[PDB]
Amino acid sequence: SGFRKMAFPSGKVEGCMVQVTCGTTTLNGLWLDDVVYCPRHVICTSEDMLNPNYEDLLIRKSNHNFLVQAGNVQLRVIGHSMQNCVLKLKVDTANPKTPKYKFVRIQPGQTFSVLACYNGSPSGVYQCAMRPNFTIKGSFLNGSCGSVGFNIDYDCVSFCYMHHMELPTGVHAGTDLEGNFYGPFVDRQTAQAAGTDTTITVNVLAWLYAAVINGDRWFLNRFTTTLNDFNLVAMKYNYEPLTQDHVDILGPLSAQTGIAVLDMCASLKELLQNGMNGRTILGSALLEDEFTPFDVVRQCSGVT
Amino acid sequence: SGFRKMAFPSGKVEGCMVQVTCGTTTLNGLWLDDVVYCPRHVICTSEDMLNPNYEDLLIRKSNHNFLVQAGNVQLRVIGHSMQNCVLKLKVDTANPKTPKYKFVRIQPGQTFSVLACYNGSPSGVYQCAMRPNFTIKGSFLNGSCGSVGFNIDYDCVSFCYMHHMELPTGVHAGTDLEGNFYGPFVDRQTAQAAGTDTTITVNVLAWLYAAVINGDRWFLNRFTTTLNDFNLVAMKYNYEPLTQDHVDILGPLSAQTGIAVLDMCASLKELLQNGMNGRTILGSALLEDEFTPFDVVRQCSGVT
């Protein structure tokens, strides 16, 4: 009973967080095995951020300039290298708390948990989606850079995001763990266009299935639609076009509830065209797109 | 930049979760020092739940009937006792992962994080509020009983909730860690009235301050109100009456933003009387009441 925006338990990731300081800049690092990963802009001052030449800035730094700490543990840095927008600091000690992990590059529309950290200390955890425009709408203040996003499958942590910056619009941008930005962004203090975002249609449909499973059913109607007709409505309302691949991933939810995917599309079409009429679905007064079909199945079956 | 429904990092609590089995019933337990706490209904079968005599049911159980496990660790039970609706199983080994902790009974309207668990394994973490009617709207399935709610201050975990049951309405009920139910509930399979709930006014005001801090300002108006006038509106809309104690706790937010508490009350009055007009505040199309003033200050200042 009930359906919440749930994050993965963060313990496995808390055990990896360290503080990285270079010069006057302090941010968060991720310590896995004998490597600490952090945003490369840890080597910048404020005047450097307007147009940094990272290669030149990194040449002025030595291993001993990177101060890495995790409470009472000071780590000894024995190597440093830049990979895209991340620095990899080789340390002489493998993190005893390294969980089983992978580095993955997620697709837009996928969800993950963020462990917000400041000065290497975890402050909170929340679930969010990678927007179709490759930004995230997180909660990040100065010092949160280097905080990571992840998913967990059994005992394996798949790290997918490292936070780098806030755009002038207040949305967030960052990289995969190889330092490649999601989206067109660069790690520089210049105004940068995020570009047109859309609503993640397959996730809204998944959430409407979660709603029916939990008893919110008022939006079910006597109609059906086609992918073509639904996509005309999706276009008008800035929703992602629905494909057969999306219909296929909704298969388990359609099978469990007995509501055909195109019939749920007709409920979504009617909600887009008429609004909520002052009612709510799973405690929301808008159409929620931060739950994937996999998230809904996981939460509705009690997977650990 | 940004404001999210953030949970506390759950690692300290994940280290305390165990599975407790008695007979055919399995649920979650909390292992702190050399005691495991769990709902007393672990001793019931399904036929017992309609009207259990817990004292009699517990008399048929011995220490060796309580199977406690945490992965590869089987705990040896050397004592058992019932305290209100919880069982306390004394074990021969102190949990090496016991964090600094306290047991607290929270007030209605306060928030906390829940680590949803099944069979002793954490599945997810979310933040919620204790409703004014002493229920929570969580996400709990069969086997989640014994999952706990908590807050964290520095390195100290204050455990405030243990989940016991879902009401026929799909809302959740549970106890403090001394086994006293929040609200009028009893641990029996009987339909039980939750009673009239209200919206947590001070939390909505705190969240409107979080909104102004993060740039959502469209709801600010040229008006002011009084506590008396505001409370007539609060009454009409089933909001908790606002008191000077609530105004006092909003003081830091009023000081930071320069918006007097009664001026924010006039914005809230106008939103109650006119609705959102199809707009959003911090990504919500309704007035959010699951952030306390302390939560807003914590999140807006980046506290770890």
Ligand SMILES: Cc1ccnnc1NC(=O)Cc1cccc(Cl)c1
């Ligand atoms: C102040 C802040 C808030 C939220 N997230 N990040 C934050 N820090 C920054 O954006 C700092 C920064 C400035 C230019 C480029 C880059 Cl890569 C980083």
Ligand SMILES: Cc1ccnnc1NC(=O)Cc1cccc(Cl)c1
């Ligand atoms: C099935 C389920 C879902 C969510 N939360 N809890 C759940 N279990 C129960 O409510 C089981 C139960 C039945 C009667 C009394 C008591 Cl104390 C417990």
